[PDB]
Amino acid sequence: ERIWILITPDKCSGCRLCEVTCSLEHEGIIWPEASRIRVFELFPGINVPHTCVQCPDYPCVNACPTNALSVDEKTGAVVVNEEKCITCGACVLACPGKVPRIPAGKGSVVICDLCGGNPKCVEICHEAGHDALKIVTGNYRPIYRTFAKDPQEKSLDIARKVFGEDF
Amino acid sequence: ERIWILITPDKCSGCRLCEVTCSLEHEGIIWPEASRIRVFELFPGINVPHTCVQCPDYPCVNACPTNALSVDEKTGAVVVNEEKCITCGACVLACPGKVPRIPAGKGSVVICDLCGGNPKCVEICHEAGHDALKIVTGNYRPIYRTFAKDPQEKSLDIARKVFGEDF
Amino acid sequence: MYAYNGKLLDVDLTREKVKEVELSEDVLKKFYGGRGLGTYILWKELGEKWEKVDPLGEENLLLILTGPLTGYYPGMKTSIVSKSPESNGVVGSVLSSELGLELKAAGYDGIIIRGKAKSPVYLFIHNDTVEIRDATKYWGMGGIELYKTLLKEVHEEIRKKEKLKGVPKEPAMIYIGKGGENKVRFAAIMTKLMHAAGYGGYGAVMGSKNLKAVIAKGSGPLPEVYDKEKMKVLLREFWKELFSMTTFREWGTGAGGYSVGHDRSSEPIRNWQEEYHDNEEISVVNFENRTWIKKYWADYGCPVNCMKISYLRYGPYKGSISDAPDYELQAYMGTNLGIFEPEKIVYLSYLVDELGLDGINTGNILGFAAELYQRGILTKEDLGFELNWGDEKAFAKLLHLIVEKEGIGKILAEGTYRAALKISEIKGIDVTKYAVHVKGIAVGAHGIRSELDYTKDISYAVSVQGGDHTSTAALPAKGYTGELVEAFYDSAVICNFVTKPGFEKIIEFGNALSGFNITPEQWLNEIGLRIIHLQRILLLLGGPDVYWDPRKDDDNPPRFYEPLPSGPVKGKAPNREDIKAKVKQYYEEIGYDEHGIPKEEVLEELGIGEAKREVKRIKKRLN
Amino acid sequence: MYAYNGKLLDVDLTREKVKEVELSEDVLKKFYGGRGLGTYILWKELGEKWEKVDPLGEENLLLILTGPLTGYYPGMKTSIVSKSPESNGVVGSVLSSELGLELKAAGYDGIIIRGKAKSPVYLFIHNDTVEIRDATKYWGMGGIELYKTLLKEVHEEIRKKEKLKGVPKEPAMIYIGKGGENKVRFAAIMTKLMHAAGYGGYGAVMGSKNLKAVIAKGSGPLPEVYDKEKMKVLLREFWKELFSMTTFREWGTGAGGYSVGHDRSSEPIRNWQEEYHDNEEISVVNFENRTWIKKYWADYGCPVNCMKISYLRYGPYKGSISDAPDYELQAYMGTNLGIFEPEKIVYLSYLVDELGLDGINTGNILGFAAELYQRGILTKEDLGFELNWGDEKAFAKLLHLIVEKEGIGKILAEGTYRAALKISEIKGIDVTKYAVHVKGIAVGAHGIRSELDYTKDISYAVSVQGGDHTSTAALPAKGYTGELVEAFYDSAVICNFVTKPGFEKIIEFGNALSGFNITPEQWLNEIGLRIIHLQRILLLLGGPDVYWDPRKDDDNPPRFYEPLPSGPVKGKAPNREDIKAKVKQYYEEIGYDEHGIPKEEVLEELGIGEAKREVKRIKKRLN
């Protein structure tokens, strides 16, 4: 059965243990901008975790000119062949949520691969007691795709909700 | 090692599963006003769980004229001998948080006994994912006693925090 | 007894009298509770003169009821039953008030309210104390102010009196807003700002009795249960299943505003002129980030916590407060009006909540008026202002006119069905073709044309609750979706959203509580069937102002036969001759005759033979 | 290089030039990072002319540093080091800015800032790009406006440049408020509204250079680590231990405002006139229910999340934002001023945060002034208004005067020590008896009289950071409390609150990162000891305006020998003769001669024999 990461920004503490865990898992080093989940804090205390939602029409996969991106048949996650990637940015532009990220000196995009079915970001978030990330099990629902949006938009929405006309 | 229930009212959903669990455990029936943890919702959406804090000077124990109340030596919970209780209200009045409660037709006060050292309210709140209740395991700290406060006071503080001058 | 108290309060507002009446085991085994028990009381006390009972007149009964599962099964619902100002039938409505829990803990299973107080009153119940009290200071208050004044004051009163017993929890309260006070026919009964007994117009019934609110507090235990150990095992089982509904606990119905239109093409858009949209502004992600200040809110004993609280701190509508909002409000106070942005939807939801108006039948009449304006039938001078799609300010002005019964609001306050008749007569134009109702009750926000939603063909057409999407009919008529099973939940009385364990398990739980031995076959062939038949009979008796004829009124609004204009199943709509065939089959399967009138033989087998006297009066009117 | 980049940025604001300078393995093995590395740079460049270096003049250096554990160990701290305008020594300060992390991911370990810009500038670091930019438009802004304008604008600039690489996370920013801009001697350097490089007056150093802010963004990996598998194992072990500190994660330091005074009798009350109170209004339960809008907030990679955000939506101080507030603010901007009410404390904490003033040395000078008003020494005419204990409006007025250096504010803007000297000269009265400082730095909110707190006898008296309660001395002078171990955390750079695994385990973690083999004994006997010895030497060389003499200034303020007036240890205070004994014993154990001047032989053994030239100048001044 497939999984999807449901995000509750107002429970995010900004601990960024999800970034430490993800980048250590996939890069073997601490590397905030290569984590496949990245937390945006554009105003202190308004923390917005951001990652792939596995759009069923995969705009990123279909935009790639070198076929470096494919879809894992088991998980539905995007899979990056780093050696075919020419860091052209087409997938970055195609993504409704601007999720693909090319960090300095990697020479490839990075995109969440759902840790092959057992997200380590969710586990550490739950272990720390925040539960800003939670797994939903079951078939994909089209509304999932509407969560791919620009993190600056989410940040500004939340700031206005918390602070009102004083923001 | 002693335990103490640390409460976070803003994480309380009002599910009142703690009341169902506690009253079923101690009365064998569902009885909201005989639960030893009671949730106050004086304005919709502002939920305040309320229970004993095990004051080190036990005002309730020391006010009882019939010595129906004692202190468990292992936990440091209040223990009620229901047979000696004459439902006089002295413990109700002595308690800084107005915690002791005499429900209709019980014939005795009820006060949290910490479930003998394994609170069932904490367990269900944690299982439900709310975590408005959590156990702290060290030695007693004097500040714990300052949490024994009138629930109407806490309720109004929170409503003013959330809704501001428009409340 | 087990699981019930065996008592109802009987409250006469005309004579200012209160008494307790007995609730016998035989009645309980035959009608169970809530919707079923209320339908019986209404038929027994009024069925012989039903067509002369004005639902807004002092002879109506307002019933506040529970059932054996209320207080033990997860979640919390109270039942409200009366003669409906909308359909002139009966609606078994429910709202997540703890009133039912507080009543049972005080020694009662429910309240029968008769007559009409000389001046505004409220009803106060505190264990053995029952009092009719002056409410003229509170008449005109919405929910927020009512919680901060009346409810807080009653709590303080009780706290001071019970001082030597400790601090009691808050009392439970149901109430009306200005819509109910002015007898708008689709006014609702409210609790906790955002919860409603939504369908049926019962806020107008309650306001017609000069009754502002009912407040109840109990501190005793619930009735004894027959099998405690079984009950505990089942409860643990149910909690564990209900905890696992991840997306429903996180989002409630809040994803509906996007999902139903985009995925199922069954969402009302501009008075049902379309049913599909592609607009992501209304997605739950934006309600959450822009408006939600409480993501997990729950009623008594509920492991689902489907509720949310939305609140605006910014913009012209700051101060507005609502829930997710519920999907039906996202549709009927939103997409139905051409409005997709969360801020505006939270504003309009807040207004109908504060005014005590059912969001479904309110949004229906607003979209109706806006289509009449679109088509030139209602002019700017008729309204006093322009009513364009998407203009939340104009819809708010219209709400004001309706509640004050001012100008065109006096006509619109009667509800879509009656207002369509009146405007047709006034304009010499048939506007009933734009009125989207069945049996005088607006169709809930789930269309039948796409057949991608749970509603199809005869869902509304034959239901004893008309356009009520929460109690639709199914084929086969028995069988676990459909009227009979919903009659059980509305009688049990439990929350639909907590029924994951399934019909058979929940019936088993109820036997563990009550000592009964009801089977699912017995519910579907006898107990639920007799509830449906009595409701069918009362609905067909109708009156005094509106009567139904099953040969034309067991049917869908004509808009539901127009092909869908847009979306992935563009062109789809059912065929009226197939609908006519399924209706005749439903009659057969449910025990009505070929004209849709309950068979006198079936009534006698159901133990309700006296109802032949009513079936006999339906037929002279019809022939 | 493992764990470091091996590079510092060198920024000359006078000439407007930027270069990279090498950081050698030899220097790093000798001084490690942060506080120790900055002390070495300051002595190397300025030690020969130290007593001529004005901390507010062009010649001072402002150093922004990291250490090898920065970016890998849990939590996040950047080091700030300079010649201090308070003590004229060095303070190893830290604040939980991700600036250090972003620097290391951009390829640098820190920044040497020299000179003075002709007009206000900010420093911009983005990977290889380093620019000095005009900051005239932002001069005068508090932190809230600065995040909403400069930082948002720099993020948008980065986003548009990097468009084909995705959206970068936000840059990190350290900044000053109007207090630093106006060279108030206890101004702080801020980050994220409510985090501070608190002790030392480094906000005035930054303002004296016309530097408004430093903004840094890096998108590369951290440096390679020597033993990555050991690092990951230790990391999991550290997380699991740190997650278990239940009450510190739930409350942070917010329980201090009540607990330190009530339980330990060591909290300043009305300029330390009392140290005990019983007042429950200041309990964390009230801060949480009345003010906390975010209960769990955390810096990069932190499993502790000790931070909270308080915010007022009501009352005259609506709009005020702060943290729990930190215990030192609850004390020094609260009980020290006779204020116990959460709402008032959040207001005054917000003011010092927005103004960029250290809350400890600010609260100290405000309570000093209020005691002088109590005693008739500062009149109403001297101040311009009455300054009563408890009057938060009067303290806010005094803050305004201090920042604008207007009236009495010009004197008070110089800090408690210098102000007391000036007022003593003006009034012909010794007010230094009321000034609670050591070596020119206000004593942090932990007293020594009760001996119930961790501070005792010589904690402040001999420390190279004076009244700084985050770097107190211990007996034995080595051993795991005390200056040498704190010197490690301030050089590692890591947060004190994440050090549960303990000194030895954290040293071992740093070896796994760096490939060094430092032992606890090497730290205590060589590396930390040489850092402390250089700090002692720079502090003893002193000002240009203020000099210390250890024969009188290695001592507690006289108020700390007054018996406690109230509470469970009423009557208690240490004896000056015992203090003198312990001071002489501390000299012996740490390697100072009988007069408290580092022994020339110890300096040679420590590898800093060149500092004998400085010890020699200290001796002719003193002889």
Ligand code: SF4
């Ligand atoms: S771990 Fe959870 S709480 Fe911490 S940053 Fe990631 S998402 Fe937010």
Ligand code: SF4
């Ligand atoms: S979210 Fe962006 S990256 Fe993920 S699937 Fe959709 S397009 Fe690809």
Ligand code: SF4
């Ligand atoms: S960046 Fe790499 S992955 Fe993205 S499209 Fe270009 S080549 Fe394919």
Ligand code: SF4
């Ligand atoms: S699921 Fe795995 S890959 Fe995707 S973000 Fe979480 S940790 Fe990284």
Ligand code: SF4
């Ligand atoms: S269980 Fe937890 S969340 Fe539910 S009411 Fe009790 S305390 Fe609140």
Ligand code: SF4
């Ligand atoms: S809280 Fe009240 S009931 Fe509990 S110990 Fe203190 S006095 Fe007794």
Ligand code: SF4
């Ligand atoms: S009520 Fe019962 S317990 Fe409380 S004091 Fe009186 S007798 Fe003792």
Ligand code: SF4
């Ligand atoms: S600890 Fe046990 S007795 Fe105390 S409230 Fe929780 S469940 Fe009831």
Ligand code: SF4
């Ligand atoms: S499911 Fe939702 S509506 Fe039903 S009882 Fe639970 S919270 Fe209330």
Ligand code: SF4
């Ligand atoms: S402990 Fe507190 S201060 Fe230290 S890093 Fe973590 S959150 Fe920041």
Ligand SMILES: [Cl-]
């Ligand atoms: Cl703000």
Ligand SMILES: [Cl-]
């Ligand atoms: Cl409000």
Ligand SMILES: [Cl-]
């Ligand atoms: Cl970048």
Ligand SMILES: [Mg+2]
């Ligand atoms: Mg609602």
Ligand SMILES: [Mg+2]
């Ligand atoms: Mg219903």
Ligand SMILES: [Mg+2]
């Ligand atoms: Mg702070």
